[PDB]
């Protein structure tokens, strides 16, 4: 039977070249005798180039291949939460089967143009620099980009951790389920990752799709789609979901590897002509639906690894061009003490304030502005043998505001805590304080109001802004704390 | 089964079997040769012809020559009787001391440990090297990588670590030389012996050795790491011990593959590499790992072609490490050894929660100032130093002294530095830097800080220099 | 003060000119690396 089954003509470098299979559809899952699956990516006149999902040691010339008739779909819904699954949705945390009812297809088209509405609900990270100057809204696609080891995955993690404030809450329209896709990473990193998340009690609301370093190319390829589907189940059901693709750089490599082995034509950097289309069809599935559709959302934090800061290399160019903004991390900043290494001047949020809270805006706005102003003069500092007090002023606001954007890891803040601290320097209170102390000030200052003043923060929170009152109360709280502070 | 050779082109040999086609990865032995020639099956070309990679020279092979399927991937003698010995890619002793009488044999090809087999303990592994310890601490059971272009210190650094760590280590050690210098395996073997880590008379050997040097055909080079790693996995799993794995240089595994790649009929990926570089690296790097059964502390030297850290190979390897020591010819060029780049070296344990805030604040304190100085370098270059704020000409000072205090005379490089090797303890390091950063030595001269161990030697050296 | 003014006028104008040149040198180099890296891939692929 050459219609529903085929015979392997040759097998190598994970590409199977099957004879027969006359009825297979493009991208169909097929099965080799040995039990290994494969996906038909090249339907040629005289053969099927099949992408083997595993070790090609188990396939020989002549092995019989059969069709499944089924296209790639994966488990989905609420039972995956707190689980560690492979790219096919299989459980790899050895905790037992995932009790999944619904199964969704991994590659589906993004919701069209009509079914959506402007991104308007804040997606809070807990990171002041991001939350005040590079705001993410639900349905937005914001890229975290930077060289190796700059803090990229940390941003995502702090972000995931942060959602417990709302996940332990009652308001079900503020909860955000998290999905973390690990592509090309080593298993020890993910293990370490899931640990950090368990320790913070964030696994309860997180799903981990993992396609690691030793998993065949095709699984690393798929991973992001199969994780996307999982997040779509939430989006579609009036629920909100967050997805982190770590990294899109490694998946591009996986895809390039199959493309070239199937002999498709190579373009710049050896990438296939459809590499742009691989990510665009992925990153567009993130969106903010309309009430007519459930008002549910899917926010995506895709990671791209640049090289020597070459944001214009091929893949970094595509993805930058596809997403709504970028958080640019930099080594120089990192080693200079700015952690997280966000380059505030080049980072962006097309969505902008349409996603900031009124509380934040109340402060974010002037901060954004003195910083931009400092950035103009900063370089002068170190040779400012005699600058006027006009600009000498902006250098001072400059370094303090900058110290306020600093942040340790695993400790995401509540929007109310961020504005209280930002207010402190923005209003001028730390202007006479020593740069070397702002980190210590904030820490203790925030410890104090989180202890003693939970009623003002609750106000700020509730009233959503800084009332003329709470404004006055903060003035005293900081002018007395500061006095205390320099005793 | 018995196949015949149909084509020979370098390290690649195509074989035609009449009945029974040996599976991929199977090792075949060429009949009619003074020495054992193993061919690893690489692909099924179809027409009952397999394409294979030779584990040795292909000279004198003939079209039609006979080849027997061994029925299994390369399998080597694994067990305790490998310790103190020197093995081949294919498991043959190469030390002239007779057979290796192991109870068992293992195939060099195997699946990597599952996700549920991973461990997450993180213990600092002190080495005695100021720079590493201070800024990019190694971790027991972690994956360590020494990155460097030709001749910047990868091996010497591996040499001083064998001395400062392998030597006291209570557990085995496996040193796999992959595509490196033959002269070097002879230097190390004889050093192991002169120091009793290798014992030729008794069973007190604490190190097994495996070698596939630069004088070998691509094939051997594409596999020794596997052989080496396989020996190490035994002590990890079947004995459950604490292993120390040294590989110099893992880049050679990847260069090996790129060298036969075209003969395997593949369109090249970027920079000439083969399109399967990352996956080829992944299925290997994923076995070099600590599990719940045993612990591996791998120190891998990583060559950097053309000195370009973005080269697909060095570039693809960062993700497999928990700590990285990046060496730089720009630093070396100044006479600062070890030439580690203080701003490009990292460790997953550089966490206040793991090494402590004193350790952490010093490290970051040292890095800020070196960064601060890096930025000014190009500028005082042209515009000079007068206009600089006393605040800024002090960081130039302290930086230049730290830059030096980071160098150290290794005990394995006296032939190089003309200085006795010093091993500094973690607290002597943290403190020394803490004080320089604190302004406590702004009076001593930079030179006093160059090529010394502990901070006291910098003070003594100041006097000696005092005239 | 008139000589520092003059000297710093020149220095600043030389700098800018240097800036304009390095930038143009940067783009030429950027384009050639891509082209160069791509021809290398094509050559290897065509030889098969």
């Amino acid at each position: 039977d050459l219609e529903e089954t085929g015979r392997v003509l040759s097998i190598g470098d994970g590409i199977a070249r099957v004879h027969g299979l006359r009825n297979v559809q493009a991208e169909e899952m097929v099965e080799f005798s040995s039990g290994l699956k494969g996906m038909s990516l090249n339907l040629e006149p005289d053969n099927v180039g099949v992408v083997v999902f595993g070790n090609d040691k188990l396939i020989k010339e002549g092995d019989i291949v059969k069709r499944t008739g089924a296209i790639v779909d994966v488990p989905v819904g609420e039972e995956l939460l707190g689980r560690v699954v492979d790219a096919l949705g299989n459980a790899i945390d050895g905790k037992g089967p995932i009790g999944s009812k619904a199964r969704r297809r991994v590659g589906l088209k993004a919701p069209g143009i009509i079914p959506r509405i402007s991104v308007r609900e804040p997606m809070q990270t807990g990171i002041k620099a991001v939350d005040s100057l590079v705001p993410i809204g639900r349905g937005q696609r914001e890229l975290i980009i930077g060289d190796r080891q700059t803090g990229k995955t940390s941003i995502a993690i702090d972000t995931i951790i942060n959602q417990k404030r709302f996940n332990d809450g009652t308001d079900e329209k503020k909860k955000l389920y998290c999905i973390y896709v690990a592509i090309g990473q080593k298993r020890s990193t993910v293990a370490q990752l899931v640990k950090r998340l368990t320790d913070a009690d964030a696994m309860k609301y997180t799903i981990v799709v993992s396609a690691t370093a030793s998993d065949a190319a095709p699984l690393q390829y798929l991973a992001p789609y199969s994780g996307c589907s999982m997040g779509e189940y939430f989006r579609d059901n009036g629920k909100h979901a967050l997805i982190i693709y770590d990294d899109l750089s490694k998946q591009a490599v996986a895809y390039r590897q199959m493309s070239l082995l199937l002999r498709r034509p190579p373009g710049r950097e050896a990438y296939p002509g459809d590499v742009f289309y691989l990510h665009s069809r992925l990153l567009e599935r993130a969106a903010k639906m309309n009430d007519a559709f459930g008002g549910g959302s899917l926010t995506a934090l895709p990671v791209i690894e640049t090289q020597a800061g070459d944001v214009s290399a091929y893949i970094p160019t595509n993805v930058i061009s596809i997403t709504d903004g970028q958080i640019f991390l930099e080594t120089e900043l990192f080693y200079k003490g700015i952690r997280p290494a966000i380059n505030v001047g080049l980072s962006v949020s097309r969505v902008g304030s349409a996603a900031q809270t009124r509380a934040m805006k109340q402060v974010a706005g002037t901060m954004k502005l003195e910083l931009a102003q400092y950035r103009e003069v900063a370089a002068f500092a170190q040779f400012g043998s005699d600058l006027d007090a006009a600009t000498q002023q902006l250098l001072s606001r400059g370094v303090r505001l900058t110290e306020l954007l600093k942040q340790g890891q695993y400790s995401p803040m509540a929007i109310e805590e961020q504005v209280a601290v930002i207010y402190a320097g923005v209003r001028g209170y730390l202007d006479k304080l020593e740069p070397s102390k702002i980190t210590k000030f904030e820490n203790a200052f925030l410890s104090h109001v989180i202890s003693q003043h939970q009623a003002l923060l609750s106000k700020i929170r509730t009233d959503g802004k800084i009332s003329e009152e709470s404004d006055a109360k903060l003035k005293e709280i900081v002018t007395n704390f500061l006095a205390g502070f320099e005793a | 089964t018995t196949g015949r050779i149909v084509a020979v082109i370098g390290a690649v040999v195509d074989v035609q079997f009449d009945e029974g086609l040996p599976p991929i990865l199977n090792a075949l032995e060429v009949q009619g040769r003074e020495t054992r020639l193993v061919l690893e099956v690489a692909q099924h070309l179809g027409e009952s012809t397999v394409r294979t990679i030779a584990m040795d020279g292909t000279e004198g092979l003939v079209r039609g020559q006979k080849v027997l399927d061994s029925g299994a991937p390369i399998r080597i003698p694994v067990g305790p009787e490998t310790l103190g010995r020197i093995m081949n890619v294919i498991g043959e002793p190469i030390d002239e001391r007779g057979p290796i009488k192991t109870k068992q044999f293992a195939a060099i090809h195997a699946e990597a440990p599952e996700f549920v087999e991973m461990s997450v303990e993180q213990e600092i592994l002190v080495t005695g090297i100021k720079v590493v310890d201070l800024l990019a601490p190694y971790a027991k059971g972690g994956k360590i990588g020494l990155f460097g272009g030709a001749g910047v210190g990868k091996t010497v650094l591996i040499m001083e670590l064998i001395n400062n760590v392998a030597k006291a280590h209570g557990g085995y050690s496996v040193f796999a030389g992959v595509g490196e210098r033959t002269r070097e395996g002879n230097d190390l073997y004889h050093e192991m012996i002169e120091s009793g880590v290798i014992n030729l008379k008794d069973a007190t050997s604490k190190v097994a050795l495996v070698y596939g040097q630069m004088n070998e055909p691509p094939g051997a080079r594409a596999r020794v790491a596997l052989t080496g790693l396989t020996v190490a996995e035994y002590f990890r799993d079947q004995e459950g011990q604490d292993v120390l794995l040294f590989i110099d240089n893992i880049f050679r595994f990847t260069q090996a593959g790129s060298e036969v790649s075209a003969l395997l009929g593949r369109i090249p990926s970027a920079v000439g590499y083969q399109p399967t570089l990352a996956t080829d690296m992944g299925t290997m790097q994923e076995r070099i790992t600590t599990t719940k059964k045993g612990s591996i502390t791998s120190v891998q030297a990583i060559y950097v072609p053309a000195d370009d850290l973005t080269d697909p190979a060095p570039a693809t390897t960062f993700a497999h490490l928990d700590a990285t020591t990046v060496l730089s010819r720009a630093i070396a060029e100044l006479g600062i050894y070890p030439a580690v780049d203080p701003l490009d070296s990292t460790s997953r344990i550089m966490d206040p929660n793991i090494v402590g805030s004193e350790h952490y604040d010093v490290a970051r304190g040292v890095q800020k100032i070196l960064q601060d100085y890096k930025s000014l370098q190009d500028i005082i270059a042209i515009l000079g130093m007068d206009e600089l704020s006393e605040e800024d000409k002090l960081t130039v000072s302290r930086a230049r002294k730290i830059q030096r205090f980071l160098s150290q005379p290794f005990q394995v490089a006296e032939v190089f530095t003309g200085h006795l090797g010093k091993l500094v303890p973690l607290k002597e390091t943290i403190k020394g830097f803490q004080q320089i950063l604190a302004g406590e030595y702004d009076h001593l001269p930079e030179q006093a800080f160059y090529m010394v161990g502990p901070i006291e030697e910098a003070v003594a050296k100041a006097d000696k220099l005092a005239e | 003060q008139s000589a520092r003014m003059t000297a710093m006028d020149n220095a600043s104008k030389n700098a800018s000119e240097m800036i304009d040149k390095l930038t143009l040198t940067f783009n030429r180099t950027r384009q050639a690396v891509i082209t160069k890296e791509l021809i290398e891939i094509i050559s290897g692929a065509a030889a098969l």
Partner: peptide, 25 residues
């Protein structure tokens, strides 16, 4: 001519130009 070095030089000259224009005024 390395995009790295070129960038390193641009970095330090853009500052020079800035500090130098300031000193002029």
């Amino acid at each position: 001519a390395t995009l790295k070095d070129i960038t390193r030089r641009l970095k330090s000259i853009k500052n020079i130009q800035k500090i130098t224009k300031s000193m002029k005024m």
